[PDB]
Amino acid sequence: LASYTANLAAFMIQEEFVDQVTGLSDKKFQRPHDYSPPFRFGTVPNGST
Amino acid sequence: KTWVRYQETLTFENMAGVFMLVAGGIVAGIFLIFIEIAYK
Numbered sequence A: 001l002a003s004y005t006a007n008l009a010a011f012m013i014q015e016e017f018v019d020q021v022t023g024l025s026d027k028k029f030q031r032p033h034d035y036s037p038p039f040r041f042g043t044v045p046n047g048s049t
Numbered sequence B: 001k002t003w004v005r006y007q008e009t010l011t012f013e014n015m016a017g018v019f020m021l022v023a024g025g026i027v028a029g030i031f032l033i034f035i036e037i038a039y040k
Ligand SMILES: *[C@@H]1O[C@H](CO)[C@@H](O)[C@H](O)[C@H]1NC(C)=O
Pocket: A045, A046
């Protein structure tokens, strides 16, 4: 029990962070109807991007 | 993606010596129990 509580505490300490989108070629970047919230992103007008 | 992006704590650490020590304690304890059975 002590080892398992220490493992849970150390796993909180070893804190990684996942991301929503990890690529410009994402399947989320095909259609926002693929998931239930339609997310949104734009660019600056008349820009090089 | 061909070479750069392609690349090549836990519970295993706190189990091995503990398991072996408890197993050796069980092996010694069974013999001590049979000594106590021979005593009574
Ligand atoms: C962007 O380009 C259009 C092209 O007609 C221009 O009318 C507009 O003033 C420019 N400004 C904006 C909105 O970025």
